[PDB]
């Protein structure tokens, strides 16, 4: 495949929920993850190159595989432990799945992580969409 | 803040 590179930015926030009883003295926290695309100047723009995003959460969660179809694909959950996870992003026009490793952790109140992905140029609608975020 | 599962 001919491909182009794009940087996506994963944004995470978390805060303690004091009304939830701590579990084994560990507080329960509310947390969220969203995903934006960066353009070639570094500005956040809606990640419309993805048809859907699936968060593959730690197996302790009820229904750990959460599907979203509208940018910024925001997920909200509660828990008491950090964990690694994979985020599946599905490019437009069945152009392919990319697995993006993330770590959900409580080290900061909010933090951002950038990932470069390679996107094919063989689906006209996706190719047109990619022109919004940089050269193709 | 270092809590892991």
Can you tell me whether residue A62 is helix, strand or coil? coil
| Nearest residue in B to A106, CA atom | B1
The beta-carbon neighbor of B3 closest among A60, A81, A108 is A81
Chain A nearest-CA distance from B2, in A, is: 6
Domain count, chain A: 1
Beta strands (DSSP E) in A3-130 are 3-16, 29-38, 44-45, 50-56, 65-68, 75-79, 83-91, 96-104, 110-120
Chain B nearest-CA distance from A84, in A, is: 9
Check if the beta carbon of residue A73 is closer than 8 Å to that of residue A50. Answer: yes
Q: Is A64 near chain B, with CB under 8 Å?
A: no
Q: Is A72 near chain B, with CB under 8 Å?
A: no
Closest CA to A87 of A103, A104, A99: A99
Domain that holds residue A110: 1-136
Q: What are phi and psi of A54, to 5 degrees?
A: -120, 120
Chain B positions touching A58 (Cβ under 8 A) are 5
Last residue before each break in chain A (C–N > 2.5 Å)? none
Q: Is A105 near chain B, with CB under 8 Å?
A: yes
Contact criterion met (CB < 8 Å) for A80 and B3: yes
Burial per residue of A3-34, b for 16 or more beta-carbon CB atoms within 10 angstroms, e otherwise: eeebbbbbbbbbeebeeeeeeeeeebbebebb
Give the pair of three-digit tokens for residue A3: 């491909």
Total Cβ atoms within 10 A of residue A56: 15
- Structure determination method: X-ray
Chain B positions touching A60 (Cβ under 8 A) are 5
What does the alpha-carbon distance between residue A62 and residue A106 come to, in Å, rounded to a whole number? Answer: 21
């Amino acid at each position: 495949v001919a491909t182009v590179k794009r940087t996506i930015r994963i944004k995470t926030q978390q805060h303690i929920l004091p009304e939830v009883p701590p579990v084994e003295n560990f507080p329960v926290r509310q947390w969220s993850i969203e995903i934006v695309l960066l353009d070639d100047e570094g500005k956040e723009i809606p990640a419309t190159i993805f048809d859907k995003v699936i968060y593959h959460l730690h197996p302790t969660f009820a229904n750990p595989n959460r599907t979203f179809t509208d940018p910024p694909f925001r997920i909200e959950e509660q828990g008491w432990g950090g964990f690694p996870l994979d985020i599946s992003v599905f490019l437009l026009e069945k152009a392919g799945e990319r697995k993006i490793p993330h770590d959900l952790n409580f080290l900061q109140e909010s933090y951002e992580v950038e990932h470069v992905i390679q996107i094919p140029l063989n689906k006209p609608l996706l190719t047109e969409e990619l022109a919004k975020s940089g050269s193709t | 803040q270092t809590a892991r599962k």
